[PDB]
Design a protein around this ligand. Structure first.
Ligand SMILES: [Cl-]
Ligand SMILES: [Cl-]
Ligand SMILES: [Xe]
Ligand SMILES: [Xe]
Ligand SMILES: [Xe]
Length: 162
């Protein structure tokens, strides 16, 4: 298991524009297109992202391409953030994958706000972090996904994904 397979499982793969759990237009492997309610705005952001007139549909390769870009951006966002990087560098490989998933999902600012959990993770207080991480809107809105990520930070193993 790795970050890619992990996110492919949590996000799924959809070749046509769809709405995510918050109702925003998305495509591929969780590639958010726009927060706007306008489908045309979404079609325009998609065409710009792909480089062609897609008419709201892309191929598997195009999806995987956007996915690679998005994972890369997520890692880079963590490294660039002064509140995230030190935590991230303190973690083992498995746990780092969990941090990437969260950022991919809610953004760097979003994760940078889990101050208290950040500190517990840095201190390697796994069970405590786990409990604090569940006290969030993220967990109440996508509890199955949040449980899998939480267990991963908790245990340092990929068990929740097997
Ligand atoms: Cl893009
Ligand atoms: Cl979920
Ligand atoms: Xe992190
Ligand atoms: Xe994190
Ligand atoms: Xe976190």
């Amino acid at each position: 298991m790795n970050i890619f397979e992990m996110l492919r499982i949590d996000e799924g793969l959809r070749l046509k524009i769809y709405k995510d759990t918050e109702g925003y237009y998305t495509i591929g492997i969780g590639h958010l297109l726009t927060k706007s309610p306008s489908l045309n705005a979404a079609k325009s952001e998609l065409d710009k992202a792909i480089g062609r007139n897609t008419n709201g549909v892309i191929t598997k390769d195009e999806a995987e391409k956007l996915f690679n870009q998005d994972v890369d951006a997520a890692v880079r966002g963590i490294l660039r953030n002064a509140k995230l990087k030190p935590v991230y560098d303190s973690l083992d490989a498995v746990r780092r994958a969990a941090a990437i998933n969260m950022v991919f999902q809610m953004g760097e600012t979003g994760v940078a706000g889990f101050t208290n959990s950040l500190r517990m993770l840095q201190q390697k207080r796994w069970d405590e972090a786990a409990v604090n991480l569940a006290k969030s809107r993220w967990y109440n809105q996508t509890p199955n996904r949040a449980k899998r990520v939480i267990t991963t930070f908790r245990t340092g193993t990929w068990d929740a994904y097997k």
